[PDB]
Ligand binder design. Sequence first.
Ligand code: XAT
Lengths: 149, 166, 196, 41
Amino acid sequence: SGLTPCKDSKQFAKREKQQIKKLESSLKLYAPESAPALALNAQIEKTKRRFDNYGKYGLLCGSDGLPHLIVNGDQRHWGEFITPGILFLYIAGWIGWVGRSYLIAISGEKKPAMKEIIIDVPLASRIIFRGFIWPVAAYREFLNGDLIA
Amino acid sequence: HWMPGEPRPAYLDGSAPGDFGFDPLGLGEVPANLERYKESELIHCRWAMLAVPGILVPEALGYGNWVILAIEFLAIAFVEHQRSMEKDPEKKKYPGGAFDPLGYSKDPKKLEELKVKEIKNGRLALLAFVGFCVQQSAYPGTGPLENLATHLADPWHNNIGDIVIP
Amino acid sequence: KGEWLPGLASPDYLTGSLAGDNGFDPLGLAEDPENLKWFVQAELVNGRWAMLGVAGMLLPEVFTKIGIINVPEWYDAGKEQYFASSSTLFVIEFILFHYVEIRRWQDIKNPGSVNQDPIFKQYSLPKGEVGYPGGIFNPLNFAPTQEAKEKELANGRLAMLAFLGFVVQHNVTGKGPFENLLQHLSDPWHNTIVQT
Amino acid sequence: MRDLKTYLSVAPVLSTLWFGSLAGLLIEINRLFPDALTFPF
Ligand SMILES: CC(/C=C/C=C(C)/C=C/[C@@]12O[C@]1(C)C[C@@H](O)CC2(C)C)=C\C=C\C=C(C)\C=C\C=C(C)\C=C\[C@@]12O[C@]1(C)C[C@@H](O)CC2(C)C
């Protein structure tokens, strides 16, 4: 959509050069072997590697020199939004399933409210491993009809 | 029946002609809906059966492929309005009367067997028309008979792999 | 009855009547009795298919290595050309497998529902437990005793593990399955997952 | 003692331990894979 790749972005190169020039301005103030100078020299390399990696991944830059993210579902940009999205969904489902399974276990007690303050660690440690298979567990429970009260 | 091992819906007992207990969506629960759907299905079957040879015959006779007006509008509007004016549920699906001078309604069992045969052939013709319509999209400007000839060139397979996976 | 971990009481829902039972269910996936049947059938089918796949993708490699025939490895079989296009063969497979898979699914729902031939009405399969059709599928008429079922399930589990191992072997090392075994035997203490 | 375990399982202390471990872990990945915007896998 009028976007150019990072590796061929003159404004991207200008941003990198300007940041490096600004960083090197403070390097001249200290002795070359001093600890502040050693710490500063490690910052320039980090900037260089970051810019190289951004160029190497085929990110798209506009007229500003800043990368843009395409989330329409293009197969060449699945790492921007699609790939991290499924990971977040899996992790959030794990957390939710563990939290839901803990409450059901203690609901049958005489005083279920007491277990919400003093957490039963031996009981909680067993349920934690069970969240690994939460997609299959939820898929099977939905079909059987036990998901909704 | 439609697919063995599946319980049939309560409103499809296998007594109706052409019935095979097919309703994965359950769109025929209301009796009035079932009567309207029966009539609509019959009309669709008859029209498709009347139409398909009129599409095929041109290409066979070499006159071309399938790809006044006021009189036509008046006649069709009058015919459909007059059909809609009928009130009996049974007479709408089968009008009888003088419309069958050949007297093929004399025998009851033969009548029912004819009804089943007509329903089956109507479903087949409807599927054939859907096939024609989808075929025209894949190969523009090519009639079904030419497609059959191209199949005769390579009688191996229904050439969907050339389309589904380009 | 076998126990998968001494000192750990087996779950109550595993009564031991099923074949190949060892009380192994740390996650309690088969708590619901309905889920147990579907999981059993899935395990059986996966075991049989994995067994066939592992055998068919291990034996030709050995045959090529010894020198009887000359066949490429299992992963690169797709590059070879055949008498028909891959799409055509996929179309034959898609139409063909649909019938048998729907038949099996229908049997799983209602046992004994699809035991009768649909074209010729005089041929049918004898009654039996779901997942073991018997009949024509057992032409030699072997005894389907519990011991044979346990052997089948054990071989299926081993085949699943072997297939996963083969996939991981190819993904990391990039070599053949049987080539790795010969490499390991040359220097056992120097060629291991640790080095790679 | 038993009271030591019971006080350690109360909601605030357990939550603080969990969040501290979480923050340490997150800092560990942020240090190991710095300046990350896309998945290169
Ligand atoms: C079927 C199967 C393999 C199928 C392979 C086929 C067809 C191979 C075919 C090919 O070779 C040919 C034919 C040609 C090759 O050219 C072409 C290909 C295609 C490559 C693998 C299954 C593989 C399946 C595996 C490995 C599953 C492992 C599951 C496990 C362990 C579960 C553990 C648990 O479930 C229990 C155990 C208890 C639960 O409670 C909880 C836990 C503990 C979590």
